[PDB]
Design a protein around this ligand. Structure first.
Ligand SMILES: Nc1nc2c(ncn2[C@@H]2O[C@H](COP(=O)(O)OP(=O)(O)NP(=O)(O)O)[C@@H](O)[C@H]2O)c(=O)[nH]1
Ligand SMILES: Nc1nc2c(ncn2[C@@H]2O[C@H](COP(=O)(O)OP(=O)(O)OP(=O)(O)O)[C@@H](O)[C@H]2O)c(=O)[nH]1
Ligand SMILES: [Mg+2]
Ligand SMILES: [Mg+2]
Ligand SMILES: [Mg+2]
Lengths: 170, 195, 218, 188, 424
């Protein structure tokens, strides 16, 4: 909507209905998408998708990955190999705003395996004030650029520090 | 032997065979024309075989023979079933002897005449004194009396004429049809979609 | 015709706050309840830049629906006073504002009992309104902090609500006996401080169609 | 040693605990802690048992059972016989835990199912209460979400256990506790 | 004061007052609100030293300041006048003591109607603060760890410590006992026995999976579909998630993966896992009612109703969810909450249970009947999300998900979760 030739890639080969999910979000918002029902390697979906949208001269190529936790070293190595195959200009750490004390440990282990440079805080439209974001800014060394404020595609806006600290304080 | 035709009407009314108890009752009404027990076994075989107007023509053709040995329930029941709730109400009240058969049909006649204050006192006494397999069906009848006080197509030949059937979509969201017809100026994000 | 006022107030409080003690939320549901009853039925009190007194007259009482408008005025001022009883435990001046909402909750219920005195309303809502007045007059004269004027309008509300139970079926008497039992604990406290000094309907008459005893016929 | 009184709420644990110590009827409420008192047994030697009445509430039934099960010489599982037919699911479920806390002990204590409240006309017999719990602990050992009950290939019974399991009938309203004081004198 | 009963904690009425008028009305409902449910206004006062409870029944809640001064003087005259009967361990000191406190109470009542016209909490102060800061850091809700800690300065105040005890180890121990008894909800569960009882009317067993966005409702619904098939049960997955993209293909991959492990050939010849779907955008109470009538007609022992994830503050949508669970009457409402959520575990279940009872139109409304604690393999000991959930709700943690596959479904080890949380 700002004028960029944006496109999506679904590099999730594990979650059920994950390419069907991003396909129906991209079909609705009129955005090109890439992914596979059949490919089981996310390094292969993400390399062959950024290669296709490079040769089509897109300016914003957003690669979606599966959910992973730090105690799974198998998914943390696969995340590092998806990041090494496509070599992303920016890595965004999306965190739920209802996360408790377990936030600083996961957010730090994401910064250690992969180079996180921006943080996004979703599910802030409800009761959660999002105090877990102080522990993912200190762990990933990355600022918050956007917040999510609902389930729809337009429930999305840039992070402003003053209204988030006034809500976090009361 | 009419005692052997009555062990045959008895053996067919026990097995639920009111089609053959009605052929064996019409063999006792050929020898005994005014048999009041064979004019009651025939009215039951016609109420059970769904002839309520043929069972009401067996009661009205023999009004003097079935007199005071009457079928005032099978007569107020055939009329209750032929859309006569004013004749089914007059035959329950004019019955010479009141039973628990005319009390069960009278709880269903009061409910049809929308007399729910008398139908509640009839169905309160019917749930107390009745010991049968239909006590869960008589607490659903009393629970409906308490809840009561409180292919046309425009034309058929024009169906297979224009384009054998209407548009294949043919009824669905109006905004989903190939016609659209919603005067839509643009798309906006209100509800869930994603098709 | 009919109005089950006690069932109306009890299921609107448990659904809109009073199950967890939210009188501020129950009153706000009462005010939005009345605004939307007023905007639907085109019964606005004021217009822009002027105000005109809402007078629910007798002609519009056939709807069986405008009694809920005045009752939502009685339940709004009642819900505000019970919220001011919780805020008067730390702000004892709030009690003066509490007692001004309870004198206008009986005045709405005394004006709603006079409306039910119309002949277009059955013998059920005249008497639910007569003894909803006598219940709010016993709670105001209980908050007067006089224990005698409290048992006088509670034993009046109990004797009214019990006179209504005896007169009809014991199934419809349940609503009036549920309300004598509802205000009965408050009467034991003021007596402790006076003497201190198509539905599914079955055709069960088709199972009764059976043969006569065929023992004499063999 | 100790004889723990267990069961659901309102089974009659504290009124049998009163009827054995005083022989009288005492008004009781819901117990939130345990209560202990000595009981001079009816036999010749007059042995002394420490009756322990444990709360029947289910925030406190297994917290006190695990505390005193190591000190238990016998356990009396008190059953509400009148209200047995609607509580068949909570009696057999609590009794399943008392059965595995029992065989897992070094010296397995002696076990009784005191079918209380027989003075009520609707009290089920200790023979119907043993049949419906053998049928219920047979479904429970399969449906339970390693010590097991009896044999897996056979229908469960209280005779298949390595425990001294008995059934008697009593009443805590004087009272009818004669079979209870005869078993309390026999295990003393 | 219309009522006053003083019994011990062993459930033994010592003395009771109900007025000269009749007598002895409501001493059992008085005990229930005052002692049973705490571990006419009916409140209480606990003597924890000698195990006493002082339950009182009064009205006009504004007279609570003089009712509390009357329980304090009655508590001071009772524990002094009968100190010999109530200080002994034997329950035969209270069975054999005579508590004739009627003339002493009529004097303390008539005299309090004229005013109207060991272990202290200072010792236990510092250790209740180190235990509250340990529960909060181990992911117990901030206020759950404050009521937990105050339930323990009450329980041990007056009580004498053991032969080898400190101030620290006493409040640290009775906090573990008030934490295992609250993590022991007043509920139980079963298996094939429970579907034999759902067959007393010849009908399936319908479970409703509700919860907030992303907790694991659909993935643990598939772990329980594999756990029901493993017990020989046929399960019909009702797909009532019509508010998202790929919410039906997610459940259709679970039904393809489960009808591979449990096919008709390896089950007897009949379909055992089948998806009931009506597309997206449809009503979630209409697809659910069609799947209960479809599993009845096609012989499915279980219906597992998957609903969409939603927030806790949505009046037009927690209305449609509370009306769904009220009207559909599911056999077990299973709230799905992750073990990663912090203080929100209290607000989710309180608004989820307040909605289910508000937008319900029954006398006793259908509330959440259990909890599924997912993402348990992610906290690693920060386990206080299991305490925050079974604290407010007196409902059990029916399952604990410990991964993403069908085999990572556990029962709750609630004893070692309080032992890990109360050890600091
Ligand atoms: N590690 C771990 N992951 C889990 C667990 N339970 C669920 N998940 C993961 O959490 C994610 C959420 O999956 P999903 O089942 O769609 O959650 P949901 O609540 O149905 N989301 P929605 O609100 O859209 O319906 C999945 O990637 C799933 O694998 C668990 O116990 N452990
Ligand atoms: N009729 C009858 N009543 C009994 C009998 N035994 C106990 N009761 C009554 O049942 C009520 C409950 O008895 P309790 O002794 O408190 O049972 P409990 O198992 O200790 O209950 P909890 O303290 O909650 O564990 C008491 O008020 C008794 O009067 C009995 O044998 N017959
Ligand atoms: Mg994904
Ligand atoms: Mg007890
Ligand atoms: Mg889902």
């Amino acid at each position: 909507r700002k004028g960029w030739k944006t496109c999506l890639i679904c590099a999730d080969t594990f979650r059920a209905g994950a390419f069907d999910q991003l396909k129906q979000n991209a079909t609705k918002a009129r955005i090109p998408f890439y992914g596979s029902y059949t490919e089981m390697d996310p390094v292969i979906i993400a390399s062959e998708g950024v290669e296709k949208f490079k040769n089509e001269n897109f300016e914003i190529i957003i690669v979606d990955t599966s959910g992973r936790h730090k105690q799974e070293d198998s998914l943390f190595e696969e995340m590092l190999q998806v990041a090494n195959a496509i070599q992303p200009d920016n890595i965004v750490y999306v965190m739920d705003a209802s996360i408790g004390q377990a936030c600083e440990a996961q957010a730090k282990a994401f910064k250690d395996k992969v180079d996180v440079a921006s943080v996004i805080v979703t599910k802030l439209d409800g009761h959660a004030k999002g105090g877990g974001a102080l522990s993912a800014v200190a762990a990933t060394k990355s600022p918050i650029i956007f917040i999510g404020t609902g389930e729809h595609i337009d429930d999305f806006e840039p992070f402003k520090t003053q209204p988030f600290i006034s809500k976090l304080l009361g | 032997s009419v005692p052997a035709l009555w062990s045959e009407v008895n053996r067919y009314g026990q097995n639920g065979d009111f089609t053959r108890a009605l052929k064996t009752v019409n063999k006792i009404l050929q020898i005994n024309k005014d048999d009041v027990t064979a004019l009651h076994c025939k009215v039951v075989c016609l109420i059970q075989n769904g002839s309520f107007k043929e069972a009401l023509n067996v009661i009205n053709t023999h009004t003097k023979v079935l007199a005071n040995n009457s079928l005032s329930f099978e007569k107020a029941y055939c009329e209750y079933r032929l859309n006569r709730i004013e004749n089914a109400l007059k035959t329950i009240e004019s019955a010479n002897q009141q039973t628990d058969k005319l009390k069960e049909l009278y709880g269903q006649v009061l409910y049809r005449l929308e007399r729910y204050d008398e139908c509640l006192a009839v169905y309160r006494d019917l749930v107390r004194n009745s010991q049968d397999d239909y006590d869960e069906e008589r607490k659903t009848n009393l629970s409906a009396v308490v809840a009561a006080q409180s292919k046309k197509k425009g034309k058929l030949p024009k169906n297979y004429d224009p384009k054998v059937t209407p548009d294949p979509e043919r009824w669905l969201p109006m905004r989903x049809x190939x016609x659209x017809x919603x005067x839509x100026x643009x798309x906006x994000x209100x509800x869930x979609x994603x098709x | 015709l009919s109005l089950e006022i006690l069932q109306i107030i009890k299921e609107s409080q448990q659904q809109h706050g009073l199950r967890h003690g939210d009188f501020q939320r129950y009153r706000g549901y009462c005010s939005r309840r009345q605004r939307r009853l007023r905007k639907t039925l085109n019964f606005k009190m004021g217009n822009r830049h002027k105000f005109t007194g809402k007078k629910v007259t007798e002609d519009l009482l056939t709807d069986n629906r405008y009694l809920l408008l005045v009752l939502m005025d009685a339940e709004r001022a009642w819900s505000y006073a019970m919220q001011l009883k919780q805020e008067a435990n730390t702000e004892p001046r709030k009690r003066f504002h509490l007692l001004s909402r309870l004198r206008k909750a009986v005045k709405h219920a005394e004006e709603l009992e006079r409306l039910c005195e119309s002949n277009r309303v059955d013998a059920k809502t005249k008497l639910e309104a007569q003894a909803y007045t006598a219940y709010l007059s016993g709670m105001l004269r209980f908050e007067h902090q006089e224990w005698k004027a409290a048992i006088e309008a509670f034993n009046k509300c109990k004797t009214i609500y019990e006179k209504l139970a005896s007169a009809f079926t014991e199934e419809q008497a349940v609503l009036y006996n549920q309300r004598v039992e509802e205000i009965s604990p408050n009467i034991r406290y003021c007596a402790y401080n006076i003497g201190d000094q198509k539905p599914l309907f079955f055709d069960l008459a088709l199972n009764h169609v059976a043969f006569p005893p065929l023992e004499d016929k063999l | 040693r100790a004889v723990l009184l267990l069961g659901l709420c309102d089974s009659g644990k504290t009124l049998l605990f009163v009827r054995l110590l005083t022989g009288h009827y005492r008004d009781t409420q819901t117990s939130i802690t345990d209560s202990s008192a000595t009981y001079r047994v009816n036999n010749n030697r007059g042995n002394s048992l420490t009756l322990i009445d444990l709360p029947g509430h289910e925030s406190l039934r297994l917290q006190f059972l695990e505390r005193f099960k190591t000190s238990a010489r016998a356990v009396v599982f008190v059953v509400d016989s009148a209200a047995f037919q609607r509580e068949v699911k909570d009696v057999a479920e609590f009794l399943y835990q008392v059965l595995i806390d029992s065989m897992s002990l070094k010296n397995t204590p002696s076990f009784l199912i005191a079918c209380n409240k027989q003075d009520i006309a609707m009290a089920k017999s200790a023979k119907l209460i043993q049949q419906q719990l053998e049928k219920e602990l047979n479904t429970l050992r399969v449906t339970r979400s390693p010590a097991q009950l009896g044999k897996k290939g056979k229908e469960f019974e209280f005779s298949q256990l390595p425990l001294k399991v008995e059934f008697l009938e009593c009443s805590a309203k004087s009272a009818d506790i004669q079979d209870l004081e005869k078993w309390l004198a026999k295990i003393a | 004061l219309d009522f006053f009963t003083i019994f011990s904690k062993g459930g033994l009425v010592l003395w009771c007052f109900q007025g000269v008028s009749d007598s002895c009305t409501g001493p059992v409902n008085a005990l229930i609100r005052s002692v049973l449910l705490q571990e006419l206004t009916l409140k209480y006062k606990l003597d924890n030293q000698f195990e006493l409870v002082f339950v009182v029944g009064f009205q006009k809640i504004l007279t609570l300041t003089y009712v509390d001064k009357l329980i304090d003087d009655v508590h001071r005259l009772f524990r002094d006048k009968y100190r010999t009967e109530i200080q002994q361990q034997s329950a035969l000191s209270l069975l054999n003591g005579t508590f004739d406190f009627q003339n002493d109470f009529l004097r303390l009542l008539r005299e309090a109607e004229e005013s109207s016209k060991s272990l202290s909490r200072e010792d236990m102060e510092s250790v209740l603060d180190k235990m509250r800061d340990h529960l909060i850091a181990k992911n117990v809700a901030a206020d759950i760890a404050v009521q937990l800690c105050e339930s323990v300065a009450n329980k041990l105040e007056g009580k004498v410590m053991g032969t080898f005890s400190t101030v620290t180890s006493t409040v640290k121990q009775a906090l573990q006992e008030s934490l295992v008894q609250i993590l022991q909800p007043q509920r139980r569960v079963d298996m094939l026995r429970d579907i034999m009882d759902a067959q007393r009317r010849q009908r399936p067993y319908v479970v409703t999976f509700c919860g907030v966005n992303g907790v694991g409702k659909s993935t643990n619904l598939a772990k329980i579909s594999f756990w029901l098939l493993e017990n020989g049960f046929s399960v019909l997955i009702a797909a009532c998630d019509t508010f998202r993209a790929g919410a039906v293909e997610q459940l259709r991959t679970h039904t393809r993966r489960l009808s591979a492990l449990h096919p008709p050939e390896k089950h007897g010849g009949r379909t055992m896992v089948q998806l009931f779907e009506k597309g997206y955008g449809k009503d979630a109470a209409g697809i659910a009612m069609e799947a209960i009538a479809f599993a009845r007609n096609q012989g499915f022992d279980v219906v597992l109703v998957d609903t969409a994830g939603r927030m806790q503050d949505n009046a037009p949508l927690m209305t449609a969810l509370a009306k769904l669970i009220t009207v559909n009457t599911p056999d077990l409402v299973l709230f799905v909450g992750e073990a990663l959520v912090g203080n929100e575990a209290v607000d989710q279940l309180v608004k989820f249970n307040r909605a289910l009872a508000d937008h319900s139109m029954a006398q006793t409304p259908r509330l959440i009947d259990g909890i599924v604690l997912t993402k348990f393999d992610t906290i690693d000991d920060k386990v206080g999300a299991a305490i925050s959930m079974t604290y407010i709700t007196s409902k059990p943690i029916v399952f604990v998900g410990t991964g993403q596959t069908y085999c990572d479904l556990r029962s709750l080890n609630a004893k070692a979760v309080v032992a890990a949380l109360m050890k600091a």
